[PDB]
Amino acid sequence: QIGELILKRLILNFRKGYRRNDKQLCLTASKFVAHLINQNVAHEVLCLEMLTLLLERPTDDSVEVAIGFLKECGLKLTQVSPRGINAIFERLRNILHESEIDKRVQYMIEVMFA
Amino acid sequence: MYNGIGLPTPRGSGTNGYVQRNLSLVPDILDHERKRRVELRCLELEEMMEEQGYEEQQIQEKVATFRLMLLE
Amino acid sequence: TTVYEMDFLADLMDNSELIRNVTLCGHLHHGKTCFVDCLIEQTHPETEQERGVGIKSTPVTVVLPDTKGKSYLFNIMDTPGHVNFSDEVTAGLRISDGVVLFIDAAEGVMLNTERLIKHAVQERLAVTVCINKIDRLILELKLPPTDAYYKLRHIVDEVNGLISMYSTDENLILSPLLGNVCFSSSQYSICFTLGSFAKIYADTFGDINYQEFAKRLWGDIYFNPKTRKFTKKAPTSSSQRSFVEFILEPLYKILAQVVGDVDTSLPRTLDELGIHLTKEELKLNIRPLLRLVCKKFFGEFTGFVDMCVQHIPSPKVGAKPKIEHTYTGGVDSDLGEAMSDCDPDGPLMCHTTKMYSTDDGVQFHAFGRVLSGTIHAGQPVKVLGENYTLEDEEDSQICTVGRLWISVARYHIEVNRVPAGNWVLIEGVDQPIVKTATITEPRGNEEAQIFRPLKFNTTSVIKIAVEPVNPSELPKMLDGLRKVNKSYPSLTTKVEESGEHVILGTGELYLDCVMHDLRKMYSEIDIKVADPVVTFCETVVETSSLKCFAETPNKKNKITMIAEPLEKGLAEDIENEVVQITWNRKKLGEFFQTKYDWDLLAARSIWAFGPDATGPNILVDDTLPSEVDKALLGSVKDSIVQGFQWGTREGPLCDELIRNVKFKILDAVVAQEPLHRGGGQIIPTARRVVYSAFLMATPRLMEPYYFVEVQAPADCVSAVYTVLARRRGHVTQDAPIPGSPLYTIKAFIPAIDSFGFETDLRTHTQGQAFSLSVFHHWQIVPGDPLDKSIVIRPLEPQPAPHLAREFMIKTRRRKGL
Amino acid sequence: IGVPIKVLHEAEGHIVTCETNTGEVYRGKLIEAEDNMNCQMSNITVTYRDGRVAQLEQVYIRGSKIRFLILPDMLKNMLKS
Amino acid sequence: FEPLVRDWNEFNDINKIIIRQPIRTEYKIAFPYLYNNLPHHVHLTWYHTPNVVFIKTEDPDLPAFYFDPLINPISHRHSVKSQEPLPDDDEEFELPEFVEPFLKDTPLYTDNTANGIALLWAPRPFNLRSGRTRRALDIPLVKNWYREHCPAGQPVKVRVSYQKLLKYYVLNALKHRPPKAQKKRYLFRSFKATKFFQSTKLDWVEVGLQVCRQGY
Amino acid sequence: KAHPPELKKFMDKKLSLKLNGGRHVQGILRGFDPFMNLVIDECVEMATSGQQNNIGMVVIRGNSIIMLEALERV
Ligand SMILES: Nc1nc2c(ncn2[C@@H]2O[C@H](COP(=O)(O)OP(=O)(O)OP(=O)(O)O)[C@@H](O)[C@H]2O)c(=O)[nH]1
Ligand SMILES: [Mg+2]
């Protein structure tokens, strides 16, 4: 119940940072949520929903937020459900190779591939 | 690697022909350059004079002084 | 050891607006020769083979129908793709008008592909692409159809970025909508453009307009079934692009049905496509079956001929933007324009670039393009050699024509006459000519120029000494050498004054094939051959702090000059023809001052460029008070520059070329009335001034480098690393290949240590890795060339501090004495 | 698509002669021939019903209003059919 | 093998060389003519055959066409990529509701396509569908074994056996003569056609004991 | 099929149109359809008398088009 309240609070903080265009708060809450998904306290569907909402309309900011989340939680999602890894890679390739994205999102995708 | 070592054929030689590697194997410069210093001292003066006039007399005046006042 | 159709061929030649001259280029093994072979079998149902590598090019001219039925005559120059044989490509690149670059779908762009797009844009040809070998994405790599789309898009965008990099003008971007690219599988009988595929869609199904359709397929257009109207992004269906759903996915299903379900579902699926197939022809194995089905459905070759016809210059349009480069005057009064007419008439200005030796004898068949006029049998013609300028006509030998041939890959079809715009193998013009020839009319002289002889992309840098076993046959060997110098475009042979015959070549495989032909065909002498070494250069690192000034034998004229180093950028510009002094001193000055803050007085002082027209050294004239002695200096500049270029060429240290150095004249005590005494005895004076400064205050040696690109599995990367360490490597880059299980490595390597590096690499890794090499740039060899305190243990390898020392002591010992 | 039509497309780029339904006779280079026999030509000589000639740079004649065309003999050598 | 057939030179003057890397026999066999005096009866071998990239699957579960983790992610990146001669809609275009993706009633794959592709790069008998039948002695089962390159830690015994098997293989290939001649007596058809030989079917072992008794 | 006539090359060019009935007009091509019906602007009737009269922008039915000739270079 305590870690559950922590998860709810981090979800509130992540949705706040994202919906209010707060880079630092969204990044910190995504850090806590990725740490949860790696500690095996947060499920894969919620991380999928986070990565999808960040990559729904990827800009520099939201794609980079997904990239920071992934730089830590890419092991849990790809080892528990490689479907998440395949979806992440394909969606990244499409939204970063078929939309007017710059060296910023280009190098974020490059870090993702690395 | 038959690196120029060994026999063509170990055949009538009394040996198996096995090879191995030896394990225990281990003064005008300043004056010519003053005339070079003087060189642009005429052109670049006559050029910077050309920037403020190419009458060929006002630049010859600035170049003549820059040639005499420098050589002094 | 074609009755009613060659006449038709002749009339096609005569139209000169139904022919296209194209060069089939690309990287190694990327599909060229199989393309050509399956194509000649489409038309005719009527060293190399053991090598599996093509060494020398072959031309084919054939008659192909398009997507409308109008026959064309096609001039197809099938080249080799080994980076060592780039010579052959240059040859084709002159005598043709467009280029079909074949790229691999599984690898993408590599060394030779980018280098060939460079060579093609700098010669102002047309550029088309065939992304070949597409089955390697379906059967081999097993890619979801959308990621096949991704990979194809990637290859096209990267080749686009490079072709933009070397060419300023955004006149053409490649994308299949414009008809720039085919998609192919040479062996599986499939080649198609959006045009051809949409026309297939129309012809078998309803009457849809194939053109407007083809405008809609590639490139992020989606399609919604209900509206039956293609849209930019607005399916939320999570559907694919027009390309995938309409062109790839049907192709995936075609293949998957053929190879997977040949027994059950194939007859049904074949019905749904309109192909009927015999019982006997459904008992074939999977590769012959697959190719047969794909041929039966995709038709023969329309994608290629369509793309090419649509974007070929057609030599009639043709010639004009070409004679800028080829011709030495281009268009002045008489012949530039006459050729530009491309009329079978009068001038008869032809360019011969190849000589394919007949198996039996010594003679060749010169091979070339007839720009203007019309050649016939027995036609007496006069050659124009490579040295011939209009006022030295001894170079022009006068001869005739024995036979005339036209070519399919290895079939010679002899004819009586050929009009301008074609290629032809001429018999009889062999003995007079070497690498290049310019043919003009015999006994009918108006006046003629030559086209500047072939320019090559790579510098031939490897050196091999040759001698017979018993000198008695030295003449026979000499015969042999002439002949191979004939058959190889950049083979440069020279008899060195120490009495030897050095051969100068591109790579180890190149020289191997050279000596193969030398011992096999042209002379049957037994020949000794030295070990390979490289040709060097000389340079400096700092200025001549003091000067030794040379004075005439008859002590009349005193020449004071020092040396100092240039910077690399401007020397490379000297090479690239960017700072061509064909300008007036004004353009020279703006160039120099504008870019590298050179002095305008430095510009007024710069006289000439040394070793030749293109010489990376510079001669500078800076002594103002005697500078106004233009009566005497304006007189002596001629001998001054002659001595300059002689000195630069003949080398101060080891008889090799210098580069990257600037010389300055600081005191010219000229003899009053510098008559013939001066004029004659001042050139050695000048070059001794050059040597004096150079040797005086900083000799240094320079050696070439090789660029190496290694494909490798993921694991064996470390392996190649170790190899490059043994050989003074400096691996620069290592990168994934997008969409492949391979990594690409890019590295440098001293051409010295490049000997056997390929085979060493492949042996250590069980064939998995593979490298090609090109000359890239010279560099300072880490030694001190002139130190007597350095003695050389005569057979073990030197450490670096003395490489330069050794390097000279050896080479002079054989040359310089 | 008809066999004669393929042979017509083959004559594109060649000099051809065309008579209309009204008997005017147009000789010159066939640039484009459409499926319906619509014909684009260039550098024409036209010979009217009275016998007089004229010269035209560029023409296009509707297929329906063509009576016939004369093609080179270069083509004669589709013998399969 | 035994050698095929059995004073001063200048190029090997030991003062006039530069030795950076010692030439070794593998180079001398890669490039027979560049690296060798008197190369006679030498076959010139070279090959850079495009490394084939076929990804063996683990299970029959996942689809046939499926991005494999083994493949490197495309993640193709570049500048703001490009724009097209893209004929924007809102003018007009429409597909007559007859035509469709050329065959959409057919699925991409089946439980037979992944297999069918694996069969495409398999050793010689198995990558086929049909052929003639060979005799039983004509089928060497172990050749593909001794033709391999680095046995890597087996006793010197077996390595010498590897090399001698390779030697026998090569001498076979090298001394190959075409048939060059044919007279085709048929011993057993000539025998059967006489009045002295009859025919039957026996157990193998029975005619074995017969042959041995008759030999004795 | 339902093909267009290949006339984009002739768009916005002045043309000479021979029609059935021995009729001739001249004008600028403004458009066409698959039947070869034309829109011709600034059209002028060339009467058999030799006299020419301005009729403005008009529709010519492809049916009755014998021949057209460009008065420009395409
Ligand atoms: N998988 C596949 N391989 C092909 C296809 N087409 C050609 N090949 C290859 O073609 C090779 C035959 O020689 P080519 O590569 O065409 O000759 P090349 O491309 O000119 O290379 P060089 O002769 O050395 O310049 C074979 O090794 C096949 O690998 C294809 O459609 N699919
Ligand atoms: Mg080849």
Q: In whole angstroms, give the CA distance from residue C771 to residue C765.
A: 12
DSSP letters spanning C204-238:
HSS---HHHHHTTSSSS-EEETTTTEEESS---S-
Q: In whole angstroms, give the CA distance from residue C543 to residue B32.
A: 15
Q: Please indicate if any CB of chain C lies within 8 Å of the CB of D67.
A: no
**Is chain C adjacent to chain E, meaning 3+ CB pairs within 8 angstroms?**
yes
For F69, the closest chain D residue by CA position comes to D59
Q: How much distance in Å is there from the Cα of C64 to the middle of ligand 1?
A: 22
Identify all chain F residues contacting D38, using CB atoms and an 8 Å cutoff.
5-6, 36
B66: helix, strand or coil: helix
C408: helix, strand or coil: strand
Pocket of ligand 1 (CB under 6 A): C 28-34, 53-54, 80-82, 133, 135-136, 185-188; E 50
Q: Residue C67 in contact with residue C306, Cβ under 8 Å?
A: yes
Residue B46 Cα distances to B42, C357, C627, angstroms = 6, 67, 17
Residue C717 Cα distances to C333, C723, C730, C749, angstroms = 61, 10, 14, 17
Nearest to C624 among B28, B29, B39 (CB): B39
**Is chain B adjacent to chain D, meaning 3+ CB pairs within 8 angstroms?**
no
Tokens 């969606």 correspond to A91
Cα–chain center distance at C784: 36
Identify all chain C residues contacting D6, using CB atoms and an 8 Å cutoff.
69
Q: List, as residue ranges, the binding site of C for GTP.
A: 26-33, 78-82, 132-135
Q: In whole angstroms, give the CA distance from residue C384 to residue C395.
A: 7
As for chain E, the residues directly before each break of C–N over 2.5 Å are: 6
| Sheet of strand C71-78: strand arrangement | C58-65, C71-78, C19-26, C98-104, C126-132, C181-185, C190-192
**Is residue F20 in a domain?**
yes
Q: Please indicate if any CB of chain C lies within 8 Å of the CB of E202.
A: no
In the 8-state DSSP scheme, what is residue C421? Answer: T
Q: In whole angstroms, give the CA distance from residue E65 to residue E69.
A: 13
Identify all chain E residues contacting A96, using CB atoms and an 8 Å cutoff.
75, 77
| The two three-digit tokens of residue C801, written as one number | 């501090």
| The two three-digit tokens of residue C330, written as one number | 């281009």
Domains plus CATH for chain D?
A: 1-81 (2.30.30.100)
Q: In whole angstroms, give the CA distance from residue C455 to residue C554.
A: 43
Cα–chain center distance at F38: 6
Torsion of CA D67, D72, D76, D80, to 10 degrees: -60
Q: In whole angstroms, give the CA distance from residue C571 to residue A77.
A: 55
Q: Please indicate if any CB of chain A lies within 8 Å of the CB of E74.
A: yes
Chain C nearest C-alpha distance from A33 (Å): 28
**Is residue F15 in a domain?**
yes
| The two three-digit tokens of residue C492, written as one number | 């440069």
Total beta-carbon pairs less than 8 A apart between chain C and chain E:
275
- Looking up residue F45, the CATH number of its domain turns out to be 2.30.30.100
Query: Taking CB atoms and an 8 Å limit, are F67 and D56 in contact across chains?
Result: no
Residue D34 Cα distances to C303, C740, D12, D37, angstroms = 20, 46, 10, 5
Query: Taking CB atoms and an 8 Å limit, are A97 and C153 in contact across chains?
Result: yes
Q: In whole angstroms, give the CA distance from residue C652 to residue C540.
A: 11
What residues have CB less than 8 Å from A57, skipping those under 6 apart? Answer: none
**Is residue F61 in a domain?**
yes
In the 8-state DSSP scheme, what is residue E173? Answer: H
How big, in percent rounded to 5, are the helix, strand and coil portions of chain F?
A: 10, 55, 40
Identify all chain D residues contacting C18, using CB atoms and an 8 Å cutoff.
13
CA angle C765, C768, C772 (to 5 degrees): 100
Provide the sign of the torsion angle of the four alpha carbons A79, A81, A83, A85, taken in this order.
Answer: negative
Report which protein residue has its CA nearest ligand 1's atom 23.
Answer: C54
DSSP letters spanning F12-47:
T-EEEEEETTTEEEEEEEEEE-TT--EEEEEEEEE-
The ligand with the least distance to the CA atom of C189 is: 1
**Is residue F1 in a domain?**
no
Task: Give which of C150, C157, C221 to mutate to test A binding, by max A Cβ within 10 Å.
Answer: C150
In the 8-state DSSP scheme, what is residue C715? Answer: T
Q: In whole angstroms, give the CA distance from residue C603 to residue C583.
A: 12
**Is residue F39 in a domain?**
yes
Q: In whole angstroms, give the CA distance from residue C742 to residue C719.
A: 14
In the 8-state DSSP scheme, what is residue C439? Answer: E
Q: Residue A96 in contact with residue A63, Cβ under 8 Å?
A: yes
Identify all chain D residues contacting C3, using CB atoms and an 8 Å cutoff.
77
For D46, the closest chain F residue by CA position comes to F69
Identify all chain B residues contacting E2, using CB atoms and an 8 Å cutoff.
8-9, 11
For E67, the closest chain A residue by CA position comes to A86
Task: Give which of B29, B33, B46 to mutate to test C binding, by max C Cβ within 10 Å.
Answer: B29
For A111, the closest chain E residue by CA position comes to E75
**Is residue F3 in a domain?**
no
Question: Domain residues for F66?
Answer: 8-70
A74: helix, strand or coil: helix
Q: Which residues pair with F27 in a beta bridge?
A: F15
The b/e string for C40-51 (b: 16+ C-beta within 10 A; e otherwise) is: beebeeeeeeeb
Residue E125 Cα distances to C213, C284, E132, E137, E140, angstroms = 46, 15, 11, 15, 12
Q: In whole angstroms, give the CA distance from residue C119 to residue C86.
A: 10
E85-90 long-range contacts, CB within 8 A, separation 24+: E85/C175, E85/C177, E85/C178, E85/C215, E86/C177, E86/C219, E86/C221, E86/C232, E87/C212, E87/C215, E87/C216, E88/C232, E89/C229, E89/C230, E89/C231, E89/C232
User: Resolution in angstroms, to 1 decimal, for this deposition?
Assistant: 3.3
Task: Give which of C542, C600, C666, C667 to mutate to test B binding, by max B Cβ within 10 Å.
Answer: C666
Domains: count for chain F: 1
Q: How was this structure determined?
A: cryo-EM
**Is residue F2 in a domain?**
no
Tokens 């191997």 correspond to C512
In the 8-state DSSP scheme, what is residue D49? Answer: T
Give the count of alpha carbons within 13 A of D33, CB side only. Answer: 24
Q: In whole angstroms, give the CA distance from residue C255 to residue C262.
A: 10
Report which protein residue has its CA nearest ligand 1's atom 16.
Answer: C31
The ligand with the least distance to the CA atom of C28 is: 1
Q: Residue E29 in contact with residue E43, Cβ under 8 Å?
A: no
Q: Helix A44-55 crosses helix A2-19 at what angle (to 10 degrees)? A: 10
Report which protein residue has its CA nearest ligand 1's atom 2.
Answer: C133
Q: Helix C508-517 crosses helix C474-487 at what angle (to 10 degrees)? A: 120
| The two three-digit tokens of residue E40, written as one number | 């006679």
Q: How much distance in Å is there from the Cα of C511 to the middle of ligand 2?
A: 18
Q: Residue C705 in contact with residue E18, Cβ under 8 Å?
A: no
Q: In whole angstroms, give the CA distance from residue A50 to residue A38.
A: 15
Q: In whole angstroms, give the CA distance from residue C453 to residue C460.
A: 16
From the list B59, B68, B57, B46, the residue with the least C-alpha distance to C600 is: B46
Q: In whole angstroms, give the CA distance from residue E32 to residue B5.
A: 19
In the 8-state DSSP scheme, what is residue C377? Answer: T
From the list C232, D5, C66, C310, the residue with the least C-alpha distance to F3 is: D5
Q: How much distance in Å is there from the Cα of C132 to the middle of ligand 2?
A: 15
Q: Which atom from ligand 1 is nearest to the alpha carbon of C188?
A: 31
DSSP letters spanning C277-289:
--TGGGSS-HHHH
The ligand with the least distance to the CA atom of C187 is: 1
Q: Residue A89 in contact with residue E55, Cβ under 8 Å?
A: no
Q: Residue C57 in contact with residue C92, Cβ under 8 Å?
A: yes
Q: Residue C609 in contact with residue C574, Cβ under 8 Å?
A: yes
Q: Residue C591 in contact with residue C617, Cβ under 8 Å?
A: no
Residue D25, judged by CB atoms within 10 A of its CB (0-12, 13-18, 19+), counts as: middle
The b/e string for F17-27 (b: 16+ C-beta within 10 A; e otherwise) is: bbbeeeebbbb
Report which protein residue has its CA nearest ligand 1's atom 7.
Answer: C31
Strands C71-78 and F65-70: unpaired
**Is residue F51 in a domain?**
yes
Provide the sign of the torsion angle of the four alpha carbons C612, C616, C622, C628, taken in this order.
Answer: positive
From the list C22, F72, C67, the residue with the least C-alpha distance to D12 is: C67
Query: Taking CB atoms and an 8 Å limit, are C70 and D77 in contact across chains?
Result: no
Interface of E with A in 77-116 (CB under 8 A): 77-78, 80-81
Q: In whole angstroms, give the CA distance from residue C154 to residue A109.
A: 15
Instruction: Please list all protein residues whose beta carbon sits less than 5 angstroms from ligand 2, which is an ion.
Output: C 33, 54
Q: In whole angstroms, give the CA distance from residue C216 to residue C177.
A: 8
